[PDB]
Amino acid sequence: RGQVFDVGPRYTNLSYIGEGAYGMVCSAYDNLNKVRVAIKKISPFEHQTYCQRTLREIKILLRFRHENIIGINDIIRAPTIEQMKDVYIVQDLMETDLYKLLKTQHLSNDHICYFLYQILRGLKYIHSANVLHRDLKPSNLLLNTTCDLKICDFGLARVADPDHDHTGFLTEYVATRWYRAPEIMLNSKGYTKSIDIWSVGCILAEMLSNRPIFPGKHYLDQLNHILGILGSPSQEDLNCIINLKARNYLLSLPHKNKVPWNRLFPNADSKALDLLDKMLTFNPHKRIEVEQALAHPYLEQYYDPSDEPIAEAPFKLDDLPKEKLKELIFEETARFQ
Numbered sequence: 001r002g003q004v005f006d007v008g009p010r011y012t013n014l015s016y017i018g019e020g021a022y023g024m025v026c027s028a029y030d031n032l033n034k035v036r037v038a039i040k041k042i043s044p045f046e047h048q049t050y051c052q053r054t055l056r057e058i059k060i061l062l063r064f065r066h067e068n069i070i071g072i073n074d075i076i077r078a079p080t081i082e083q084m085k086d087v088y089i090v091q092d093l094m095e096t097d098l099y100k101l102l103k104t105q106h107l108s109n110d111h112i113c114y115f116l117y118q119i120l121r122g123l124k125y126i127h128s129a130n131v132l133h134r135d136l137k138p139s140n141l142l143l144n145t146t147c148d149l150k151i152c153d154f155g156l157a158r159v160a161d162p163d164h165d166h167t168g169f170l171t172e173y174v175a176t177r178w179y180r181a182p183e184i185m186l187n188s189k190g191y192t193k194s195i196d197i198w199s200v201g202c203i204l205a206e207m208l209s210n211r212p213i214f215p216g217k218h219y220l221d222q223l224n225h226i227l228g229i230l231g232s233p234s235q236e237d238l239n240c241i242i243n244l245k246a247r248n249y250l251l252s253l254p255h256k257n258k259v260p261w262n263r264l265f266p267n268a269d270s271k272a273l274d275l276l277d278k279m280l281t282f283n284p285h286k287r288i289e290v291e292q293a294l295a296h297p298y299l300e301q302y303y304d305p306s307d308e309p310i311a312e313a314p315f316k317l318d319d320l321p322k323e324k325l326k327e328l329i330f331e332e333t334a335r336f337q
């Protein structure tokens with residue numbers, strides 16, 4: 001679109017797909033490996049934050065190999081650090097994403113069940129590598145005509161760090177508001193695996209009704225949408241809240257009873273709602289883990305631990321200047337030259 005998309009000599013015949021904060025994505029013909037691929041142009045080097053998100057996307061996707069996780073097939077950039085101003089990331093081309101599908105189609109239970117299984121199968125692999133995605137939502141679940149589902153966008157991913165998850169009440173957060181677990185607003189930095197399970201619970205709810213379950217209009221409104229459905233937290237859950245300010249705030253609220261899942265989703269499968277309840281558990285310590293979710297009765301037709309692979313070894317940037325991050329991005333993309 002009169003921007004500049006220099007991907008030769010391997011890729012030709014471009015067509016605009018979309019754009020966002022990250023940059024722009026087109027489809028293109030891989031003249032060396034038969035078919036059309038997706039190529040995204042990233043221009044991150046003027047700011048540390050954009051460099052961090054780019055290095056995470058690249059380092060992680062290059063180390064992962066899983067059917068339900070988008071791969072990186074190739075990376076195009078200049079031959080020297082001085083001339084490198086953009087980076088083009090080549091990935092398998094997908095037809096749509098769950099966000100776009102839910103705007104035009106109501107899904108049958110058997111589609112919801114199969115898509116949920118794939119999300120959880122990919123998430124099992126991510127979590128087995130000690131990685132957190134931290135921004136799961138419908139637009140980050142890519143889909144094709146044969147209903148294959150691939151998780152994308154690891155720009156906000158982190159290595160899990162439960163010992164350093166604690167933070168103060170109403171601490172700012174970057175990931176997508178509607179998919180934030182309640183603890184993000186109360187006492188958590190989103191450094192435990194439970195953060196992702198909550199987001200998957202939101203996605204399941206959204207597949208059941210074609211509407212976001214907790215559409216907060218702003219930061220604090222997100223927690224009151226969550227409490228408006230889950231109802232007031234139990235005494236046990238309040239005494240696990242850590243922060244004086246978070247405890248005081250929850251104790252100051254009028255009592256609110258839980259809205260039954262069968263009243264929000266009167267046409268849903270009862271086993272889907274039992275699993276939804278366990279993913280949307282207020283206390284992250286009581287929230288179901290990915291392996292338990294895969295073993296839940298709702299997914300019994302697909303559950304097969306021998307066909308739900310894990311990573312061969314776990315993964316083991318904050319305040320690193322943009323210049324150092326550019327050098328690391330250069331080194332990480334060297335294998336494709």
Ligand SMILES: CC(=O)c1ccc(N2CCN(C(=O)CN3CC[C@@H](C(=O)Nc4ccc(O)c(Cl)c4)C3)CC2)cc1
Nearest residue numbers: 021022038044050053054057091092093094152153155
């Ligand atoms: C603000 C700013 O300058 C900025 C700069 C960088 C930045 N990063 C975010 C994380 N990165 C990504 O590339 C994430 N991508 C972007 C697009 C999405 C994706 O994978 N789509 C996709 C893939 C295959 C397909 O077949 C199809 Cl149809 C679509 C996730 C790195 C860059 C964020 C922000």
